[PDB]
Copies of this chain bind each other. A is one copy, B any other.
Amino acid sequence: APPNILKHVVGQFSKVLPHDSKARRLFVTSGGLKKVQEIKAEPGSLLQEYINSINNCYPEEIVRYYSPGYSDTLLQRVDSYQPL
């Protein structure tokens, strides 16, 4: 779906997922929240709050695991790291 349609889908997921554990398990095992993280949102548009609510349904470790571009942060941390 185009970016202007994904807002309704993300809102519906953020409205249905908090009241269903099996739905969240199926969403995680299918790799959908990774795609949600790969969807941008305006800092203040309803899509941003929908995405934040989506992330609030899972522990921060899982969200960071499915967060794009974090591995590059780890690799640059290793580049800047120096051993003793």
Taking Cβ atoms with an 8 Å cutoff, the residues of A that contact B are 59-62, 64-65, 70-71, 74-75, 77-83
Contact = CB atoms under 8 A, between A and B. Distances in A.
Contact of A65 (B70, B71, B78): B78
Contact of A78 (B70, B78, B82): B70
Give this chain's copy count.
2
Contacts of A82: 59, 61
Q: Is the interface of A mostly helix, strand, loop or mixed?
A: helix
A77 B75 CA distance: 12
7 contacts: A59-B82, A61-B78, A61-B81, A62-B78, A64-B78, A71-B75, A74-B75
Contacts of A78: 61-62, 64-65, 70, 74
Contacts of A65: 75, 78-79
